[PDB]
C-alpha cells in the first residue's frame, strides 16, 4: 500500500495522529491538523520535507 | 512526474510553500512568492541555483 501515518504533536490546533498519503509534505500535515497555532515558529521547520512513516512532526513554539 | 515543492522563507512578500517546475530557479521562486521584501539583501543569495525538492529558500535581510 501507499498510505502513511504521522504523529503531529506541537503547536497545532488539533495535535494527534493522522493518516497521510505516501508522498505528502509537512505543510499538508499542518493543514490536516486544523492549522497552525498562533504561538508557532515555522522558521526553523522545513514545510516541504517528504513525510516519512511513523515519525514525529513537531511544530516549535516562538522562543523555544 | 516532473514537479517540485519548495519552502520559501525569508524576506519575501508571501513566504510559504509553493510548487515549482522541476528545473526552475531561485529567481522564479521569489517571483512566485510575490517578490522581494523591501528589507531583503539579494547580494548574499544565488538567484539562479537549481531548485532542489523539499528544501528551503531563505532570503536574508539586510545586515544579517
CB B4 within 8 A of CB B53: yes
Closest C-alpha to B62, from B36, B37, B40 = B40
B3 contact A CB<8A: no
Secondary structure class of B4 (helix, strand, coil): strand
Separation of alpha carbons B8 and B17, rounded Å: 6
Measured CA to CA in angstroms, residue B61 lies from A3, B37, B54 at distances of 40, 9, 22
> Helices (DSSP H) in chain B: which residue ranges?
26-32
Separation of alpha carbons B36 and A32, rounded Å: 30
H or E element that contains A16: strand A16-21
For residue A37, count other CB atoms closer than 10 A to its CB. 16
The full DSSP string for A32-49 is HTT-B-TTB-GGGS-TTP
- Cβ of A48 within 8 Å of Cβ of B16? The answer is no
**Domain-wise residue ranges, chain B:** 3-59
Closest C-alpha to A26, from A52, A1, A60, A2 = A52
Q: Which three cell numbers stand for residue B43?
A: 547580494
A49 contact B CB<8A: yes
In CATH, B3-59 is 1.10.10.10: no
Give the method of determination: X-ray
- Cβ of A49 within 8 Å of Cβ of B54? The answer is yes
> Helices (DSSP H) in B19-61: which residue ranges?
26-32
Amino acid at each position: 500500500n501507499e498510505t502513511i501515518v504521522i504523529d503531529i504533536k506541537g503547536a497545532v490546533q488539533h495535535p494527534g495522529v493522522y493518516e497521510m498519503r505516501t508522498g505528502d509534505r509537512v505543510s499538508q500535515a499542518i493543514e490536516k491538523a486544523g492549522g497552525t497555532s498562533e504561538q508557532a515558529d515555522e522558521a526553523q521547520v522545513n514545510l516541504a520535507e517528504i513525510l516519512q512513516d511513523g515519525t514525529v512532526v513537531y511544530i516549535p513554539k516562538k522562543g523555544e
